[PDB]
């Protein structure tokens, strides 16, 4: 079972997202269902190592956002144009 630790984003936009990536973090989104979409920030190294396993894209993952647990599935991924880095991830509520 994949357990991802996330924090809600205090900011949004181009400036804020590039600042996250410069701090070894990256933005991500959780959407689907009746709930409002949740904009989150992830640790780059932790999620990068996880997604190296094929099970990350098939299994139901759990995002831990301030104590609360969110059951999700990896929906889409924006990878860096040429480096082995992640730019953004879409999670759909499972």
């Amino acid at each position: 079972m994949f357990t991802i630790n996330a924090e809600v984003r205090k900011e949004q936009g181009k400036g804020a997202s590039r600042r996250l990536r410069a701090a070894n973090k990256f933005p991500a989104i959780i959407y689907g269902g009746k709930e409002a979409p949740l904009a989150i920030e992830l640790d780059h190294d932790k999620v990068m190592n996880m997604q190296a396993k094929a099970e990350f894209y098939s299994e139901v993952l759990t995002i831990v956002v301030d104590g609360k647990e969110i059951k999700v599935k990896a929906q889409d991924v924006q990878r860096h144009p040429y480096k082995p880095k992640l730019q953004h991830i879409d999670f759909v509520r499972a």
């Binding site: 094929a54 894209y57 990896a74 889409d76 991924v77 990878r79 144009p81 040429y82």
Partner: protein, 136 residues
């Protein structure tokens, strides 16, 4: 040697080569040779690299060339002054932006594709990286 069979126009404005590539994933094969740098690949460079990777795999597996030299390059010969018309088309280039997957391969083990792509990369004017197919 790659070249458009026919074109609407013979000559093209110099233009610029800003931005990041479209077609950054391994879409057909198992492995890919990706551009890390920005530049122009000539038809001769593309053919030299295609030959190097093909010899390496002993013409086994399958090879895809994701790039096409569709941009005509003109040149003015020696002892010719400025003006008096745009020069003559001499060769064709593909514009390359960081991230383009240039070549793809499958039907061969990873170690052989890495070696074939290492040999092909030594013919190219731009820095490259070895990439693998991903799940989404």
């Amino acid at each position: 040697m790659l070249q458009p069979k026919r074109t609407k126009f013979r000559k093209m404005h110099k233009g610029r080569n800003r931005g990041l590539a479209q077609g950054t994933d391994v879409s057909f094969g198992s492995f890919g040779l990706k551009a890390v740098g920005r530049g122009r690949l000539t038809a001769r460079q593309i053919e030299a690299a295609r030959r190097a990777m093909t010899r390496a795999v002993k013409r086994q597996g399958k090879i895809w060339i994701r790039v096409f030299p569709d941009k005509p390059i003109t040149e003015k010969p020696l002892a010719v002054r400025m003006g008096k018309g745009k020069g003559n088309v001499e060769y064709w280039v593909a514009l390359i932006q960081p991230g383009k997957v240039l070549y793809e391969m499958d039907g061969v083990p990873e170690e052989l594709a890495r070696e074939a792509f290492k040999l092909a990369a030594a013919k190219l004017p731009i820095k490259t990286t070895f990439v693998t197919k991903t799940v989404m």
